[PDB]
């Protein structure tokens, strides 16, 4: 789901020139906006506690 | 004189006419980035080069390719101001036209079937503001130029630190712009070795074998040949006369010393030699007998006695051998061939593949592509144009101007030149020479990172084309803009050279945009830097300022561009010089670099010139090869263009710099960048004349783009009606300047633009309309003029302490405005959504008095520490309350709520006025009431300029309608133009309203953001750091009452009392001269004030002004008779507070002029007055130096340095107190404090500071309870860090334990 999210964001960014918003990115993936946000708010790779 | 300069003319004490005006201070940034973005038809600079370096993209199979046509940058979404407001990057979209072409497998290659061309988006390029800054993530940033090693070949040595022998090992090293390093060194046994990518050494001959060089060819290139023949059964030399200059000489009478010049006047082509002369010599060719079929003697083999006989029996009569000396020529290459183990090209390739890839099985084809990729491949090796020119200059090559890869002749000449240096001919290159170091600016760095991103996309595009399925694919399917955008964002946001913009004052602006750093990517390291790089090389004259380099670890590693320094087309610093012809000196100038500087002699501005325009002294001071000396007048070639050429802008603002030690001048230059703007900006009484340039070129001021008359003036807007000579046809005719009012800087300092114009007066181009921070009437104004007495006062100016009157505290001369940001972010959590509301539990009504209905404080609310700014409630989980707590709840009621108070409160010891509130809401979230009110406020503020423009356009149109009143045709035309204007206004307002109403792209998880701006007026108090411009810093020790401070005969008390003890030891005498000159200037100012007061006739005022401006033999010719009556009155009004005087650096006012102005002001010639003690009334028995000095308030305040803590937050792992005021941390008790307590014998204090105060978790709670009870006893336990250590050691499989 995350990979498809990124791929469709890539296609829409190429097509319309801007970064897709969570509204427009919902209809092309036929999946609800709330779940789009839920996938987006998934915690990314944690930042190390050693970073300068 | 310009209008803004005619209002307050600064008296100039310089004597040398100025030939070259100081150029734009920020050209180093603007020119670089313009080169980066502007179109390049020849494609050597800018994004064109980056696109042409990677494109076209070839697939592995060759079925298809992607080609590049052109590029453009679109219209930005926002402008700079709102990009700062929302917190987004100011950038333009890159749109590149590409064509996809497909080649058939059956048909021959190069046949075009169909082309698919279109415009694809490949990221957003951050633009540079006119002032030379970037807006990244809403913050202003500066890209700092880098001083790096120039690409090319560098010849250096060891100096003899490798081995105890007196021998010096020499080496050469080639640095490519992109590629792998290659070194040629000498070992301490006279052999030359090669090093690729800093690997283990290899004989140099390997890099020749791999290049198709047989041993005979190697000996041919690297040695000279001496030949022998067998004539009439006799051995025979050849004739080279220079070689001989001792067994005998077979030239009959030309014989010698069984000096050669004696009979070298006569020549004969024959010399006979014994057999013994050849035994010690080495061969040069390979000799094979057909009859024997074997190899008798090999090349580079020592010839033996039997070798001659066997060769003679073979029939060979000509024998050529090498030429070897002990001084001029050496056996280095021959011995290197003798120590190599290879014999053929492929064996050497195997050796270098084994070394390059240790342990890999020897593969031949891999070897070939490896070597071809190492240096001879354009993809992995690139010697830039600058590197190519440095290469062609170092080895003397004169061709291959566009080649970027090494070839045969390059390595051949590098070896030849290094061997020539080992022989004695030639010298090493200076590593710190500015001709060997280059300036790399924003354009080049952006090009490099853009090319990295382009390569990132190139890989994937090549792979996709290599798939081959190409039927319906338009080019916006292989291009992935996200990697390129990631690369540019990484460079512009996380590079060490992309730093936050130092925004204390305009001087900080300019000095940050003209800084050169030796650190950063491809640079140096603070710990690994050496003495040589930090030192001042002689090539720095006119290129880098020798004064301002930060004190400390970064000494010498960070430099400043000099006033007139420039960057050439290659990135090397150059400085201007006036040429001399026929002994006369010409106005026009040439820019010279470090290499071009060595040849000529260069005089300097201090050299006296005659009225005929030529040198007076026969022996003038000049420089050659970095050495100063006296040279004949007719030998001169160039002269310096200005006296401030060697010093940068910050040091050019120090008056009487030539009377100060370099250390204190450096401290003053560094410390003048830390000044904080005050409420009222006042000019420096004693200046250098550079202030106008810095103020204008900093961009803080509002500069008139076109001339005209100010139609309207307001504190926020200036409208100028442009003159009808600069009006482009069809234009409205007005220009609108909106002024920044109370905007937070990067350093929490007010940025305010103040109008300095009236309605109706005329303004020209370049005139100042508004004064920004630290600017007064277009002049840079950092500090304030303070009355200064140099005398000790009861120890309150001990060391560098400063004693300050109460008058300046009451007059708010050093009060500052600080704007602070506070943010409250309402997020979404697992328990629920965090809400911003006024229904805060467990809080009364008084704390909600300043809150509105939404839960946000009003604009203009006076808040103090602990006051709620944004009311926020957070959902919380169930609490298992303790038994006594549920007793309390049962008895008193007060049932618990479901929300906890997590609200934005004003920090302690902070009290100010709320001046702005910004609410940012995620799309799809209910916009609160306050968000709506702010939206309407911004709409109302924004429609005004469009309304005024539409009104003036419609007024002009209706005036045309009335003037016209065939008739119906003109009426219809006017109506349709009116409709067009209405439509244009509607479109502009629609775009605006869309911008304000547009939602905010917040981070995931956050629902609302509220930002509060607090304004704090910080007054001057003890502990604050105050300074001058000569390195004389200090900390205020007391705010003295007025009646207690020294005063003069007229009753005027001093303002600041300074210690004289710090002047003689620190060798900053420019401060005393500044005090004397300021005394004279304020004397003249009060004389003009008097003349104004009793309304004396304008004739006497004009005479006095002319007398003042004609003092000394100076270069300034001010004609008061050429000024109007009102202009003279304005000049007299602006000179009431003192006469501004300009003393340029190294061209300053002599003591005679200072005493003359003191006499004109009716003041003592010595500058010392009789002071009286305020406490006692008794006069001091020695005269005291009293005058006026420019004081600065540095951004080192005791308000944000005072910090205190008893118990707060603790670290997660170490269980130790935090570190820092912002985190409410504790002070560090390091190793040396422990040593000091051990030396004292304080076992108990040490134990307490180790266990209870830091990490004994139970100990600190028990100690707090005991102190509250009143016991002052401790029961120490085990430190937590030792348990962490024990666990960590046990995790390494080591049994560490405590015994009983």
UniProtKB/Swiss-Prot annotation, chain B:
Gene Ontology BP term (one): DNA-templated transcription
Keywords assigned by UniProt, alphabetized: DNA-directed RNA polymerase, Nucleotidyltransferase, Transcription, Transferase
CDD domains for the chain: RNA_pol_B_RPB2
Catalytic activity: RNA(n) + a ribonucleoside 5'-triphosphate = RNA(n+1) + diphosphate
Disulfide bonds: none
Gene Ontology cellular-component annotations: DNA-directed RNA polymerase complex
Keyword NAD attached: no
GO molecular function, one term: DNA-directed RNA polymerase activity
EC number: 2.7.7.6
Gene3D superfamilies attached to this UniProt entry: 2.40.50.100, 2.40.50.150, 3.90.1100.10, DNA-directed RNA polymerase, beta subunit, external 1 domain, DNA-directed RNA polymerase, subunit 2, domain 6, RNA polymerase alpha subunit dimerisation domain
Pfam family of the protein (one): RNA_pol_Rpb2_3
Keyword Transferase: yes
Annotated function: DNA-dependent RNA polymerase catalyzes the transcription of DNA into RNA using the four ribonucleoside triphosphates as substrates.
Membership in a protein family: Belongs to the RNA polymerase beta chain family.
UniProt subunit comment: The RNAP catalytic core consists of 2 alpha, 1 beta, 1 beta' and 1 omega subunit. When a sigma factor is associated with the core the holoenzyme is formed, which can initiate transcription.
Protein's recorded name: DNA-directed RNA polymerase subunit beta
Organism of this sequence: Vibrio cholerae serotype O1 (strain ATCC 39541 / Classical Ogawa 395 / O395)
């Amino acid at each position: 789901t995350i990979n498809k999210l990124n791929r469709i964001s890539r296609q829409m960014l190429q097509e319309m020139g801007r970064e897709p918003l969570p509204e427009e990115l919902a209809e092309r993936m036929q999946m609800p906006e709330d779940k789009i946000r839920k996938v987006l708010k998934i915690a990314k790779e944690p930042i190390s506690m050693e970073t300068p | 004189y310009s209008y803004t300069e005619k209002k307050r003319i600064r008296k100039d004490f310089g004597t040398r006419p100025q030939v070259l005006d100081i150029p734009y201070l920020l050209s180093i940034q603007l020119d670089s980035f313009e080169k980066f973005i502007e179109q390049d038809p020849e494609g050597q600079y800018g994004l064109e080069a980056a696109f042409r370096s990677v494109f076209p993209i070839q697939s592995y199979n060759g079925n298809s390719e992607l080609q590049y046509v052109s590029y453009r940058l679109g219209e930005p979404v926002f402008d700079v101001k709102e990009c700062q407001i929302r917190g987004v990057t100011y950038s333009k979209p890159l749109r590149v036209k590409l064509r996809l072409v497909i080649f058939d497998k059956d048909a021959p290659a190069g046949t075009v079937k169909d082309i698919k061309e279109q415009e694809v988006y490949m990221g957003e390029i951050p633009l540079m503001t006119e002032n030379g800054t970037f807006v990244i993530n809403g913050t202003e940033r500066v890209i700092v130029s880098q001083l790096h090693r120039s690409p090319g070949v560098f010849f250096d040595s060891d100096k003899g630190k490798t081995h105890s022998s007196g021998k010096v090992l020499y080496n050469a090293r080639i640095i490519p712009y992109r590629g792998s390093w290659l070194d040629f060194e000498f070992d301490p046994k006279d052999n030359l070795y090669v090093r690729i990518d800093r690997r283990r050494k290899l004989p140099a001959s390997i890099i020749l074998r791999v290049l198709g060089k047989t041993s005979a060819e190697i000996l041919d290139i690297f040695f000279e040949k001496v030949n022998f023949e067998v004539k009439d059964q006799t051995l025979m030399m050849e004739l080279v006369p220079e070689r001989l200059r001792t067994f005998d000489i077979e030239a009959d009478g030309k014989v010698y010393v069984e000096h050669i010049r004696q009979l070298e006047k006569d020549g004969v082509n024959f010399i006979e030699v014994p057999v013994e002369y050849i035994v010690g010599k080495v061969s040069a060719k390979d000799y094979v007998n057909e009859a024997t079929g074997e190899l008798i003697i090999t090349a580079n083999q020592e010839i033996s006695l039997e070798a001659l006989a066997n060769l003679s029996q073979a029939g060979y009569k000509k024998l050529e051998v090498l030429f070897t000396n002990d001084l001029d020529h050496g056996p280095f290459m021959s011995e290197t061939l003798r120590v190599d183990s290879t014999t053929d090209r492929i064996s050497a390739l195997v050796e270098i593949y084994r070394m390059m890839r240790p342990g890999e099985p020897p593969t031949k084809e891999a070897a070939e592509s490896l070597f071809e990729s190492l240096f001879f491949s354009a993809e992995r090796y690139d010697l830039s144009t600058v590197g190519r020119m440095k290469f062609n200059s170092s080895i003397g090559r004169e061709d291959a101007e566009e080649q970027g890869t090494l070839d045969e002749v390059d390595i051949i000449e590098v070896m030849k030149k290094l061997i020539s240096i080992r022989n004695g001919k030639g010298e090493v290159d200076d590593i710190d020479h500015l001709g060997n170091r280059r300036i790399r600016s924003v354009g080049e760095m952006a090009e490099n990172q853009f090319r990295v991103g382009l390569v990132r996309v190139e890989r994937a595009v090549k792979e996709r084309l290599s798939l081959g399925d190409l039927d319906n694919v338009m080019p916006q399917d292989l291009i992935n803009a996200k990697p390129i955008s990631a690369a540019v964002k990484e460079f512009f946001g996380s590079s060490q050279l992309s730093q936050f913009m130092d925004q204390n004052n305009p001087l900080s602006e300019v000095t940050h945009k003209r800084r050169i750093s030796a650190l950063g990517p491809g640079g140096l390291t603070r710990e690994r830097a050496g003495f040589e790089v930090r030192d001042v090389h002689v090539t720095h004259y006119g290129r880098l300022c020798p004064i301002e380099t930060p004190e400390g670890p970064n000494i010498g590693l960070i430099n400043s561009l000099s006033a007139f320094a420039r960057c050439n087309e290659y990135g090397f610093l150059e400085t201007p010089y006036r040429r001399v012809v026929n002994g006369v000196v010409t106005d026009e100038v040439d820019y010279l670099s470090a290499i071009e500087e060595g040849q000529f002699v260069i005089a300097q501005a201090n050299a006296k010139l005659t009225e005929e325009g030529g040198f007076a002294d026969e022996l003038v001071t000049a420089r050659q090869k970095g050495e100063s000396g006296l040279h004949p007048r007719e030998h001169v070639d160039y002269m310096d263009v200005a006296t401030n050429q060697v010093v940068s802008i910050a040091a050019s603002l120090i008056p009487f710099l030539e009377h100060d030690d370099a250390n204190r001048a450096l401290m003053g230059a560094n410390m003048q960048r830390q000044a904080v703007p005050t409420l009222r900006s006042e000019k420096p009484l004693v200046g250098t004349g550079i202030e106008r340039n810095v103020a204008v070129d900093s961009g803080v001021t509002a500069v008139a783009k076109r001339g005209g008359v100010i139609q309207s003036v307001d504190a926020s807007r200036i409208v100028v009606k442009v003159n009808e000579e600069e009006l482009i046809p069809g234009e409205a005719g007005i220009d609108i300047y909106n002024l920044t009012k109370y905007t937070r800087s990067n350093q929490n300092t007010c940025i305010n633009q103040r109008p300095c114009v009236m309605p109706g007066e005329p303004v020209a181009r370049g005139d100042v309309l508004a004064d920004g921070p630290s600017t007064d009437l277009g002049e840079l104004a950092l500090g304030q003029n303070m009355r200064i007495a140099f005398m000790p006062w009861n120890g309150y100016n001990f060391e560098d302490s400063i004693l300050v009157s109460e008058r300046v505290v009451q007059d708010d001369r050093f009060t500052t405005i600080h704007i602070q940001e506070l943010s409250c972010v309402a997020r979404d959590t697992k328990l629920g959504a965090e809400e911003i509301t006024a229904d805060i539990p467990n809080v009364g009504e008084a704390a909600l008095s300043k809150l509105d209905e939404s839960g946000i404080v009003y604009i203009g609310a006076e808040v103090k520490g602990g006051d709620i700014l944004v009311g926020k409630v957070t959902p919380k989980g169930e609490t298992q309350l303790t038994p006594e707590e549920k007793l309390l709840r049962a008895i008193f009621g007060e049932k618990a709520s479901d929300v906890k108070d997590t609200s934005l409160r004003v920090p302690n010891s902070v009290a100010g006025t709320v001046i702005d509130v910004q609410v940012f809401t995620r799309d799809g979230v209910e916009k609160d009431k306050r968000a709506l009110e702010i939206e309407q406020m911004q709409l109302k503020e924004a429609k005004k300029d469009l309304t005024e423009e539409f009104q003036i356009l419609e007024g002009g149109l209706l005036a045309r309608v009335r003037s016209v009143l065939e008739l119906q045709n003109q009426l219809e035309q006017l109506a349709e133009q009116y409709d067009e204007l209405k439509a244009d206004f509607d479109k502009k307002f629609e775009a605006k309203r869309r911008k304000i109403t547009q939602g905010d792209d917040l981070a995931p998880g956050v629902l609302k953001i509220v930002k509060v701006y607090l304004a704090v007026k910080r007054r001057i108090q003890p502990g604050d750091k105050m300074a001058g411009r000569h390195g004389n810093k200090g900390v205020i020790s007391k705010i003295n009452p007025v009646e207690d401070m020294p005063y003069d005969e007229n009753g005027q008390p001093v303002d600041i009392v300074l210690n004289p003890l710090g002047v003689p030891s620190r060798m900053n005498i420019g401060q005393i001269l500044e005090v004397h000159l300021g005394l004279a200037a304020k004397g003249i100012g009060d004389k003009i004030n008097q003349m104004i007061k009793e309304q004396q006739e304008l004739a006497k005022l004009r005479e006095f002004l002319q007398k003042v401006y004609d003092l000394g033999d100076t270069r300034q010719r001010v004609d008061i008779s050429e000024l109007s009556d009102e202009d003279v009155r304005t000049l007299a009004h602006n000179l009431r507070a003192g006469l501004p005087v300009a003393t340029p650096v190294f061209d300053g006012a002599p003591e005679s002029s200072i005493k003359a102005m003191l006499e004109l002001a009716d003041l003592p010639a010595s500058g010392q007055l009789t002071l009286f003690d305020g406490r006692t009334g008794d006069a001091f028995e020695r005269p005291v130096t009293v005058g006026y000095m420019y004081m600065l308030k540095l951004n080192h305040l005791v308000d944000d340095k005072m910090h205190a803590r008893s118990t707060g937050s603790y670290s997660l792992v170490t269980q130790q107190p935090l570190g820092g005021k912002a985190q409410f941390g504790g002070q560090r008790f390091g190793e040396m404090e422990v040593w000091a307590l051990e030396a004292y014998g304080a076992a108990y204090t040490l134990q307490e500071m180790l266990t209870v105060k830091s990490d004994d978790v139970n100990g600190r709670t028990k100690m707090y309870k005991n102190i509250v009870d009143g016991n002052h006893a401790m029961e120490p336990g085990m430190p937590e860090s030792f348990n962490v250590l024990l666990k960590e050691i046990r995790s390494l499989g080591i049994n560490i334990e405590l015994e009983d």
